Amino acid sequence: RELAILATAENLLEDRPLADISVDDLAKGAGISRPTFYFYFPSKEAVLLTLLDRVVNQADMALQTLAENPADTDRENMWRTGINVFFETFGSHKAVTRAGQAARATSVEVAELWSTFMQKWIAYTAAVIDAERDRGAAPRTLPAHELATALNLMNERTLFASFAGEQPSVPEARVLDTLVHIWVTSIYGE
Amino acid sequence: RELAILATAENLLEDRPLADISVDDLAKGAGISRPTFYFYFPSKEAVLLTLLDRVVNQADMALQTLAENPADTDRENMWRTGINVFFETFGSHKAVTRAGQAARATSVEVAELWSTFMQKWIAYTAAVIDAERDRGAAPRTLPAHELATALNLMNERTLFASFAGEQPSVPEARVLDTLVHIWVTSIYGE
Numbered sequence A, B: 001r002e003l004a005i006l007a008t009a010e011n012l013l014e015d016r017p018l019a020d021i022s023v024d025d026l027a028k029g030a031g032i033s034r035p036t037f038y039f040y041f042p043s044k045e046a047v048l049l050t051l052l053d054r055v056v057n058q059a060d061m062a063l064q065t066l067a068e069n070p071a072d073t074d075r076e077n078m079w080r081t082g083i084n085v086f087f088e089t090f091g092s093h094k095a096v097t098r099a100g101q102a103a104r105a106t107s108v109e110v111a112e113l114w115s116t117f118m119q120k121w122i123a124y125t126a127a128v129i130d131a132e133r134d135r136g137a138a139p140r141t142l143p144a145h146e147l148a149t150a151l152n153l154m155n156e157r158t159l160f161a162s163f164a165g166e167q168p169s170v171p172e173a174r175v176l177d178t179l180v181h182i183w184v185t186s187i188y189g190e
């Protein structure tokens, strides 16, 4: 029934914002009553937090999997496989992505979740840049953590604008190539 | 008295969010009554829209001024002078920047203002990249408008995270050099 509430919420978020979804809407979709809903989640806000937590951990575990089983390809394709984790994971859950980013403004728990994982993904990015510099493949230009931070924030803004069809945005079918170019040139360029 | 209302609002936004500022707060600061406030602005939301409109046009007119009077320096310093318009203009009005970005979620007029100017700044960016390619200084890699869009969105997210001291963020004293590196490598890199 927890899974039914979560699937109901993800389905309804494709049609309307969390503000237009009632606890009664979530309960009906999961085949339970309102007070029975409160046995599983304290609020509709907690439901979105759990949905975002699932998608964020999905992306994180995919990047951990790549990290353990390196692809046998050139540096451009290495970075492309990493960015693609986020493109495919968040782009496969557009309504949770959209609603979760909007909740950053109003939910300390959402803001803290997003902050925690971005710090982790930025640290990992910087560690890989540092490894590329140590082996002589990348030049020692900017501080690696500072470069990693700007590239990770570029991807957050640019992928999510693309998925939402914002004006302006890179077309979704061009956004991966766009970001790979900017990561590879900025990491390997003198 | 319009200028007094606007100065009052900019001052109060340094201490608290627009949600915690009342029309009565703005009126008191400008030395007028509540109904007299409504003679100048329909809402506190319109006051923020005007503040954001002023800062956005300040940045736009600064970039127009640079465009007319080119600086006599290398390509890295050219791009640095352009990014610096946004760093100095928005970084000199941090409370309006913060409040204006937050209002994008709730105000169609704010969202449309921000969208309109980003389109203009992206078009100008793409026109300069195209000129650099035409003269043989930049290689024909990505579509220039797509590259321009991702670089402009990177700057929006990265400058505003820096000004807000978000975790994560590039330190404010490093953010200009960080962005200049990524623009120059991605625009001139093969």
Ligand SMILES: CC(C)CCCc1nc(-c2ccc(C(=O)NCCC(F)(F)F)cc2)cs1
Pocket (backbone or CB within 6 Å): A066, A067, A070, A071, A078, A079, A080, A081, A082, A083, A086, A090, A121, A122, A124, A125, A128, A151, A152, A153, A155, A156, A157, A159
């Ligand atoms: C083959 C193995 C060793 C992977 C090596 C390539 C790597 N890629 C990354 C990386 C991290 C973050 C993001 C990124 O997109 N952040 C932003 C996340 C989001 F959601 F905000 F967009 C994109 C790539 C780090 S190392």
Ligand SMILES: CC(C)CCCc1nc(-c2ccc(C(=O)NCCC(F)(F)F)cc2)cs1
Pocket (backbone or CB within 6 Å): B066, B067, B070, B071, B078, B079, B080, B081, B082, B083, B086, B090, B121, B122, B124, B125, B128, B151, B152, B153, B155, B156, B157, B159
């Ligand atoms: C010497 C003359 C000819 C200027 C040539 C250098 C140029 N610089 C730009 C440019 C445009 C936008 C931004 C930019 O930061 N956008 C994002 C704005 C904001 F506010 F969202 F951060 C940054 C530089 C375009 S051509």
